[PDB]
Enzyme design. Structure first.
Site, short mmCIF file in Angstrom:
data_model
loop_
_atom_site.label_atom_id
_atom_site.label_comp_id
_atom_site.label_asym_id
_atom_site.label_seq_id
_atom_site.Cartn_x
_atom_site.Cartn_y
_atom_site.Cartn_z
N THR A 1 0.82 -1.57 -0.14
CA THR A 1 -0.02 -0.08 0.01
C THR A 1 0.66 1.44 0.11
OG1 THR A 1 -0.05 -0.01 2.44
CG2 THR A 1 -1.60 -1.26 1.60
N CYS A 2 0.28 2.37 -0.78
CA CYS A 2 1.37 3.78 -0.86
C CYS A 2 1.55 3.78 0.97
CB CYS A 2 0.43 4.87 -0.90
SG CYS A 2 0.83 5.56 -2.58
N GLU A 3 0.74 4.09 1.63
CA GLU A 3 1.51 4.19 3.24
C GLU A 3 0.46 3.12 4.40
OE1 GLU A 3 0.61 6.65 0.89
OE2 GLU A 3 -0.32 8.55 2.41
#
Length: 540
Positions: free
Chosen positions: A331-333
């Protein structure tokens, strides 16, 4: 007087072609000295040297478009300094206390002197600046665009406008409440502070050109649509996935100390950068490094830097650590906090395997409790991360560690910052987290430590005979249970011929053995470290 003599030699020492311009300036300086002219504007004569002394009374000095390489010591009476066009000027002299306006643009300044407490207008754009001095309390306009800045110092409450275009800013400090204009366009900012929401409804915020995270973009859309704040950013622009740097480059930005082997260790990471999952690990280092926590506390570097040393000596640990980082980047973050803890656990497991806790069972419990407290704070950090639109898990979790280090006896935390405030996390939140952490530790630490990885490693080393007895028993209990359950289906004339039915019975038998194994491990833990498992916190 004496000043006239200094100006005389300055003109006479002027190189060929400069004396005409140099002489002209002297007349203006003489005019100031005689009739007390408060403004001294040196003409664009291309002068490369300025007189060592100047009229002390002048409160305003202007030096445009001259090939100057340095400036004379400024008079105490200056309140307005304007230097422009001096592309060879790489530093400014000591700033007088009474200076109010400092305009140094289209220069090559690489450093800025200590700002006087009365400065209100600072314009150092189009320079070589890499770091700014502490801002004066009375500053209201800050022109720092067109520089190499990567961090912004603490912003005074009175700051009205701030322009930081075409810089290298990676993190932003908490913004002043009364900020009319904030231009951090075209920087390296991946996320923004929550203080942005506290600006006036009519404030102009320019955030275009930054590698803003997808979550940050969604937050800005909600912020503008609910608070009416004028925010300009890139919405229809294609979302740019993060490009990982070479692992050695990211590690180098952490190993900045003067220890004997730090620089040599970093060079080893070039080869490590070719290992599997190195890109994910590199991203994790940059994500943590580009934070106001890193920029403000050198203790943050001391933690990560020392951790890299162990990874450089243990190939098995390093590979598993890299695999942990894939979670944060998948996931992006918002998976970084979980990955960081699982990196510490694997580190502790190898430390336990090395035998550090073979004779420190008391320390093992202390480390176990501390990891439990940090693990609990991770969940609490995520809860506040969702509440805060512009703040993610990492920033909240760092705040919890910094403020609750002494409250929760978090010896692992090397950061000691008491004046570092992360907007969106109030004292009521910290106390609730502090209370919830203590409540969980007393209630369920004994259950938690059973599945703790390092505990199994230590048990295998100091109680192997009993530990392997449990493991062997689980195999025997599973086999006996499977035959027991296998016959039960036969009596019901159920399906046992097919392989899947044998597998399903196996999971039932395997589950029973796991329950038996867990109970056995619970007794063993109490026998070995039962005394250390007593409640830690006196609560209500």
């Amino acid at each position: 007087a004496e000043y006239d003599a200094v100006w005389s030699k300055w003109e006479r020492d002027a190189p060929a072609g400069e004396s005409p311009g140099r002489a002209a300036v002297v007349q203006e300086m003489r005019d100031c000295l005689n009739n007390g002219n408060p403004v001294l504007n040196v003409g664009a004569s291309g002068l490369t040297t300025l007189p060592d002394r100047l009229p002390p009374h002048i409160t305003t000095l202007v030096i445009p478009d001259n090939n100057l390489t340095s400036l004379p010591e400024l008079p105490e009476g200056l309140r307005e300094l304007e230097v422009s066009g001096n592309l060879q000027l790489t530093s400014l002299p000591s700033l007088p206390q009474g200076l109010q306006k400092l305009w140094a643009y289209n220069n090559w300044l690489a450093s800025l002197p200590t700002l006087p407490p009365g400065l209100g207008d600072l314009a150092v754009s189009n320079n070589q600046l890499t770091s700014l001095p502490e801002m004066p309390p009375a500053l209201r306009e800050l022109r720092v665009s067109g520089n190499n800045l990567t961090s912004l110092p603490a912003l005074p409450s009175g700051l009205q406008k701030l322009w930081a275009y075409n810089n290298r800013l990676t993190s932003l400090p908490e913004m002043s409440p009364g900020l009319q204009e904030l231009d951090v366009s075209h920087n390296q900012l991946t996320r923004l502070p929550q203080s942005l929401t506290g600006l006036s409804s009519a404030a102009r915020v320019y955030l275009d050109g930054n590698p803003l995270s997808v979550r940050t973009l969604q937050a800005l859309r909600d912020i503008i649509g609910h608070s009416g704040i004028r925010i300009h950013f890139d919405m229809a622009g294609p979302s740019v996935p993060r490009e990982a740097r070479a692992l050695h480059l990211a590690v180098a930005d952490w190993l900045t100390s003067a220890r004997e082997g730090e620089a040599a260790q970093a060079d080893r990471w070039q080869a490590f950068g070719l290992e599997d999952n190195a890109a994910a690990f590199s991203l994790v280092l940059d994500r943590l490094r580009e934070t106001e926590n890193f920029k403000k506390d050198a203790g943050f570097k001391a933690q990560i830097s020392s951790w890299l040393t162990q990874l450089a000596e243990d190939a098995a640990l390093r590979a598993k650590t890299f695999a942990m980082a894939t979670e944060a980047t998948s996931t992006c973050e918002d998976r970084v906090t979980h990955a960081l803890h699982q990196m510490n656990n694997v580190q502790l497991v190898h430390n336990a395997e090395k035998g550090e806790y073979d004779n420190n069972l008391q320390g093992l419990v202390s480390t176990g409790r501390e990891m439990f407290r940090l693990a609990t704070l991770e969940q609490i950090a995520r809860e506040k991360a969702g509440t805060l639109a512009l703040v993610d898990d990492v920033e909240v979790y760092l705040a919890f560690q910094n403020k609750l280090k002494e409250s929760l006896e978090l010896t692992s935390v090397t950061s000691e910052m008491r004046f570092f405030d992360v907007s969106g996390v109030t004292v009521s939140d910290l106390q609730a987290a502090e209370l919830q952490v203590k409540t969980a530790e007393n209630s369920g630490f004994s259950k938690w430590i059973l599945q703790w990885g390092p505990l199994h490693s230590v048990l295998e080393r100091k109680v192997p005979e009993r530990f392997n007895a449990l493991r062997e028993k689980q195999i025997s209990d599973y086999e006996d249970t499977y035959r027991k359950l296998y016959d039960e289906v036969l009596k019901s004339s159920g399906l046992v011929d097919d392989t899947d039915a044998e597998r399903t019975i196996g999971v039932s038998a395997m589950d029973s053995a796991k329950k038996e194994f867990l109970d056995g491990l619970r007794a063993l833990v109490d026998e070995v470290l039962g005394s250390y498992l007593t409640a830690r916190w006196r609560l209500n």
